[PDB]
Amino acid sequence: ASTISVKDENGTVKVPKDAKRIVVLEYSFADALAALDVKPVGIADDGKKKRIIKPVREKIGDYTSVGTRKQPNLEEISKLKPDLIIADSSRHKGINKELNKIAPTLSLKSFDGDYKQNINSFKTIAKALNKEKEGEKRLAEHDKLINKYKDEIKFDRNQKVLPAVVAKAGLLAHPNYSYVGQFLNELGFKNALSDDVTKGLSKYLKGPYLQLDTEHLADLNPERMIIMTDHAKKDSAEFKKLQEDATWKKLNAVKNNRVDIVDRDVWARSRGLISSEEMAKELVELSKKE
Ligand SMILES: [Cl-]
């Protein structure tokens, strides 16, 4: 058993050179494998096939679900007898000992990674699979496409942007150091949540995100909002109440048609090469509307 030594979030892992059958426990890792022409044998897909973004899903084809990302089914992982498991370094600390009894296990950032950290996880996966050159090629293509979309996005970058999900009668905002915040910065946007602004709102943190009620949204008054919702729907009971709010109606972004509702699976959950390309393409399209 010859191996390739790579670094992951727990130290060194010796990955077998004959690793071909791989179980992945986050969506971004499925994207990584598809980009490298590898079809995972198992995916933690939350029992929801549509959570795997379409071009990735269609390239991989048939696979076995191993359950939720929160609580993967280790009997189903065992039964697959994989060569390698790719686990999330935040979600899967508790199951790590059990996963290592089944197969060599890489522990990589996805859930608590920003945009650059997710691309770093892609690089580690490529190296682990003896596909370093293929990964370099793919990332050069990705970067060229992202910068082409950047130049086609017509929006005025002086209009500061707030990315968020809907929660608890307000918005649960993704700050400038989140995956989405950092990606928007890569596209030349200015996040409304500057470091100074976020410092002055920190009593409202809920883990990685900032809970903004309408009073605090009114004070921030970002010129643009991107609101990520399941299925890109805007008619949830929660989001409808938020809008009957007198303060919401006076917001600059609302008065001027600069609130866009986008798909949460693509924008928040996927964290892949294909999904980030799709986010950028969507911004081009929105910017070219009448
Ligand atoms: Cl997620």
By C-alpha distance, which of 232, 171, 182 is closest to 206?
171
Neighbouring CB atoms inside 10 A of 156's CB total: 9
- What is d(CA 289, CA 220) in angstroms, rounded to the nearest whole number? 26
2 Rama sector, left if φ>0, alpha if ψ -120 to 50, beta otherwise: beta
Which CATH class, in words, describes the domain spanning 109-290? alpha beta
Cα Rg of the chain, angstroms = 20
By C-alpha distance, which of 32, 1, 37 is closest to 16?
1
Asked if residues 218 and 186 have their Cβ atoms less than 8 Å apart, the reply is no
In the reported structure, the alpha carbon of residue 268 is separated from the centroid of ligand 1 by a whole-number distance in angstroms of 6
In the reported structure, the alpha carbon of residue 76 is separated from the centroid of ligand 1 by a whole-number distance in angstroms of 21
Locate 110 and state its tokens: 């996805």
Asked if residues 266 and 279 have their Cβ atoms less than 8 Å apart, the reply is yes
- What is d(CA 44, CA 52) in angstroms, rounded to the nearest whole number? 10
Locate 180 and state its tokens: 């989405």
In the reported structure, the alpha carbon of residue 269 is separated from the centroid of ligand 1 by a whole-number distance in angstroms of 4
- Angstrom distances, CA of residue 104 to CA of 94, 153, 252: 16, 43, 52
In the reported structure, the alpha carbon of residue 71 is separated from the centroid of ligand 1 by a whole-number distance in angstroms of 13
Amino acid at 226: I
Asked if residues 83 and 18 have their Cβ atoms less than 8 Å apart, the reply is yes
By C-alpha distance, which of 270, 277, 288 is closest to 228?
270
Asked if residues 128 and 104 have their Cβ atoms less than 8 Å apart, the reply is no
Locate 92 and state its tokens: 């899967």
List the determination method.
Answer: X-ray
Asked if residues 279 and 267 have their Cβ atoms less than 8 Å apart, the reply is yes
Locate 135 and state its tokens: 């990964």
Asked if residues 187 and 283 have their Cβ atoms less than 8 Å apart, the reply is yes
In angstroms, this model's resolution equals 1.4
- What is d(CA 224, CA 243) in angstroms, rounded to the nearest whole number? 16
- What is d(CA 224, CA 201) in angstroms, rounded to the nearest whole number? 19
Locate 175 and state its tokens: 């700050």
In the reported structure, the alpha carbon of residue 250 is separated from the centroid of ligand 1 by a whole-number distance in angstroms of 32
Q: Is 88 helix (H, G, I), strand (E, B) or coil?
A: strand
- What is d(CA 5, CA 177) in angstroms, rounded to the nearest whole number? 30
- What is d(CA 248, CA 156) in angstroms, rounded to the nearest whole number? 22
The domain locations on the chain are 1-108, 109-290
**Tally: H helices and E strands in the chain:** 14, 13
- Given the structure tokens 């500057």, which residue do they identify? 194
Are 1-108 and 109-290 the same fold in CATH?
yes
Burial class (CB in 10 A: 0-12, 13-18, 19+), 140: exposed
- What is d(CA 28, CA 90) in angstroms, rounded to the nearest whole number? 14
Core vs surface per residue 219-249: b (16+ CB within 10 A) or e: ebebbbbbbbbeebeeeeeebeebeebeebe
Locate 224 and state its tokens: 């643009």
| CATH no., domain 1-108 | 3.40.50.1980
- Given the structure tokens 């990606």, which residue do they identify? 183
In the reported structure, the alpha carbon of residue 112 is separated from the centroid of ligand 1 by a whole-number distance in angstroms of 9
